[PDB]
Write a protein that binds this ligand. Structure first.
Ligand SMILES: *Cc1c(COP(=O)(O)O)cnc(C)c1O
Ligand SMILES: *Cc1c(COP(=O)(O)O)cnc(C)c1O
Lengths: 388, 388
C-alpha cells in the first residue's frame, strides 16, 4: 500500500493555496490582474493550426516511429543547423511530449540513484523534481540579484563532486528572463568540458529575445562541448503551442537511442497530427514569431519601466523569455506572504519566488494585455507604498 | 558514456525488422499481405476527428490540468460506471498519453528496486520493459496452447513471494486474442485479494469481443478487488485512435494522485485538442464501434477457419481483440526463423511470438481487408507445406 520512494520524494506544490484563492476570487467575479501565467497569451498561429487539421483529415492518426515522424526529425535537425550552428542529423533528434518529456527522458537515461545534478537557482519548478524521479540528488547553486541571477563558471567548478553527473543550463531563463551572453556560455562550457560533465541545454526560449540580446547554444561553444551536451527544447514558447505538447531532444546518437527506448516504453510516439503542426512551424515563414515578439517587447517596456519606478524592489533587466523576477527583499517579507497579501489586498496575482528556489523574489509574466499590465502595476506600486 | 542501469536493461525490439520492413516493402511496390499490424485499419470515426478540429479552431491549445480536462475525466468515469460496472468518479481518473503511459505512471508510482511483478506470458512486449524501467523484477508465467494461453489462479498463487508487488492482467489479450471469462476473472481476482496483491487491469480491448464473449473488469469482481486494482485503458483500439495518444488510469484516489504528480513532472497534460476528441468518442453514439466490430467479426471467421484447416498449426479460439496466436511447434522452428522466411519468400507479414515471450508461436492480425486475408492465408498454407 506504499508508493515507490521516488514519487514520495517529490515535493508538493508551494503555490497550491494561493492558486486556489485566485481561482475562487475569479469565480466570484472579483477584478483580478494576473501575472502568474507560464505560457504566451497568443493563439497558435493559424497556418500551424491548419496543418494539424489537414493532417487529421488526411488520416494521420496512426502509430508512428517512437523517435518521431521522419519529416519532423529532419525539419528539427535542419533548424538546429541553420539557427544554432549545431551539426545534427535526423538520427540525433527525438520528438517528445514537450520540452518537459525531453528533459525527463534524458534524466531517466543518464541519472542513476546517487548521481548529483547541478541546478542553478532560481530554477524552473520541475527540474529538481524530475531529478528526484530519476533517483538523483539535486545540487542547487544559489544566485543573487546582485549577480543578475547568473551562476559563474567558478561557482559550477566548486560544486562538482565525484558524484556530479549533469549540469542543467537554462538560457534564456524561466523565471528570471535573464540571458547568458555568448562569452558567458562559452566560459561555462569550458568548465563543463574540463570536468568532462554532460550539460543539458534548455533552450526553449531561444527566440524570445530583446535589446539585440543573442542566444548561443552551449553545444556550439566548441566541438568538445558539442560531444557532451544535449539540447532540450520545443515549439511551446516560440509558437504559442504549450497545449500541443511537442518538443525534442537533440544530442549524440548513443544517448538519443537510449532516450528513444524510454519514449517507446512510456508514451510511444507523440500525437501524430500534433507533430504535423510542428512541421509547419519550422517549414514556413517566421513572421508570426517576430510579430508576437514585437508585442512582447512592447509589454516588457511598460512593465520594466513601472517596476523600475517602484520602491522596495530590485529588478535586474531581463533580455529574454517573458518574465520579470524582482527581489522583494527590502519589504522584509517572504515571497509567500508578499504574494498572498498582494492578492488579498490589491487583487494582483504573482508567483512567489520560493517555488523557484528564491524566497526573496517573485515572478511576473507580461504575457497578457497591456491594460491588465498598466492597472496591475498601479496596484502593485500602491501595495509597496503601503507596506514599506 | 555510461547510461543508467534502468535503460541498459531494456531489451531491443526483434519485430521492427518485420513490422517495419513489410511497410518498406509495401512502399516499394511489393504486394505484401500484412498481418503484423497492432492497430485497426479503419480511420478514426469522423465525428471524433471533427471534435478535435473544432477544439483547435476554438483555441484549445494551451496548458491544462496535469490530471486531464475535467470534462474528459468525467466522461471517462461515467463510461466506466455505465460499461464496466465500476463506481469511479472524476477524482479517480488520470488522462495519459495512451494506455501505455497509464501503465508506465503506475509502475513508477508503486514499483521499486527489488519489487517483483507477475506477468502472464505471452505478454504485450512493453510489460517487462516497463517493469525494468521502474527497476522492478518481472516474474513471467508461461502458458501453453493446451491451457488456451491463459494462466490459472494456482499458477499465480504459486508465483507470489513476499517481494511480489503487482499482477499485470490483460484481457482481452494482445497477442492471443484470448478472453478470460467473468468466472475466470473472478477466480484470479480472489487469489490477488487473498494475497493482498494489487492488480493492473489492462482492459484496452474490452469492447472488441466475438461469439458473444463477455468482458468483466477485475475491479468489478468484488469490493475487495476494487480496493487494490487499477484500470489502464484508453481510446486507441475501440475508436481507431492509436496515433492520438489518449488513454487513462483509473483507481484509488491516493494512487491516482501519485501517478498525477509523475504526469505533471514528465509530460504535463495530454495534448489538449486530442483530449476533446476523446470526449466526443464517449459522448456520441457508439455505432462506429459496432460497425467496425462487425467488419472484424467477418474477417476473424475467415482467418480462423483458414487457420483451423492448416495442419502444422494449433490455434486456440480467440474471442477478443483482433489477433490470432497459432503455435508453429509442429514445424520445429523458431518464430524468428519462421516469420523471417515467410515474409522473404511469400511477402506475408506476421510477428514472431518470441517478442511476446513465446518463440513457438506467431501473432496474426486480421485488421485488414478480406481479400488480403484470403490471399495471405493461401500463401501461408504453401509456406507451411514447404517446410513440413
Ligand atoms: C516551459 C518550459 C519548458 C518546456 O515546456 P513544454 O511545454 O514541455 O515544452 C522547459 N524549460 C523551461 C525553463 C520552461 O519554462
Ligand atoms: C494497444 C495496447 C495498449 C494501449 O496502447 P495505447 O495506444 O498507448 O493506448 C495497452 N495494452 C495492450 C495489450 C495493447 O495491445
Amino acid at each position: 500500500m506504499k508508493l515507490a520512494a521516488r514519487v514520495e520524494s517529490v515535493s508538493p506544490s508551494m503555490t497550491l493555496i494561493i492558486d486556489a484563492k485566485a481561482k475562487a476570487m475569479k469565480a466570484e467575479g472579483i477584478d483580478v490582474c494576473s501575472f502568474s501565467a507560464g505560457e504566451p497569451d497568443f493563439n497558435t498561429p493559424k497556418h500551424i493550426v491548419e496543418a494539424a487539421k489537414a493532417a487529421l483529415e488526411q488520416g494521420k492518426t496512426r502509430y508512428g516511429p517512437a523517435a518521431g515522424e521522419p519529416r519532423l526529425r529532419e525539419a528539427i535537425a535542419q533548424k538546429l543547423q541553420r539557427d544554432n550552428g549545431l551539426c545534427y542529423g535526423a538520427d540525433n533528434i527525438l520528438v517528445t511530449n514537450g520540452g518537459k518529456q525531453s528533459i525527463f527522458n534524458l534524466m531517466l537515461a543518464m541519472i542513476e540513484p546517487g548521481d548529483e545534478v547541478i541546478i542553478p537557482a532560481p530554477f524552473w519548478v520541475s527540474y529538481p523534481e524530475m531529478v528526484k524521479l530519476a533517483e538523483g540528488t539535486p545540487v542547487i547553486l544559489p544566485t543573487t540579484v546582485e549577480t543578475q541571477f547568473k551562476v559563474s563558471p567558478e561557482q559550477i567548478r566548486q560544486a562538482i563532486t565525484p558524484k556530479t553527473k549533469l549540469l542543467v543550463f537554462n538560457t534564456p531563463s524561466n523565471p528570471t528572463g535573464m540571458v547568458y551572453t555568448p562569452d558567458e556560455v562559452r566560459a561555462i562550457a569550458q568548465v563543463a568540458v574540463e570536468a568532462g560533465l554532460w550539460v543539458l541545454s534548455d533552450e526553449i526560449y531561444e527566440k524570445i529575445l530583446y535589446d539585440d540580446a543573442q542566444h548561443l547554444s552551449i553545444g556550439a561553444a566548441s566541438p568538445e562541448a558539442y560531444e557532451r551536451s544535449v539540447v532540450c527544447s520545443g515549439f511551446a514558447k516560440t509558437y504559442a503551442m504549450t497545449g500541443w505538447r511537442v518538443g525534442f531532444l537533440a544530442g549524440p546518437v548513443p544517448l538519443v537511442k537510449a532516450a528513444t527506448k524510454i519514449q517507446g516504453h512510456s508514451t510511444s510516439n507523440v500525437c501524430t497530427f500534433a507533430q504535423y503542426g510542428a512541421i509547419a512551424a519550422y517549414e514556413n515563414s517566421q513572421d508570426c514569431v517576430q510579430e508576437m515578439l514585437a508585442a512582447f517587447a512592447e509589454r516588457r517596456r511598460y512593465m520594466l519601466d513601472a517596476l523600475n519606478a517602484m520602491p522596495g524592489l530590485e529588478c535586474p533587466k531581463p533580455d529574454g523569455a517573458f518574465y520579470m523576477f524582482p527581489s522583494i527583499a527590502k519589504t522584509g517579507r517572504s515571497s509567500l506572504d508578499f504574494c498572498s497579501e498582494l492578492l488579498d489586498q490589491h487583487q494582483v496575482a504573482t508567483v512567489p519566488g520560493a517555488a523557484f528556489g528564491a524566497d526573496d523574489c517573485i515572478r511576473l509574466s507580461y504575457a497578457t494585455d497591456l491594460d491588465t499590465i498598466k492597472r496591475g502595476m498601479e496596484r502593485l506600486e500602491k501595495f509597496l507604498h503601503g507596506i514599506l
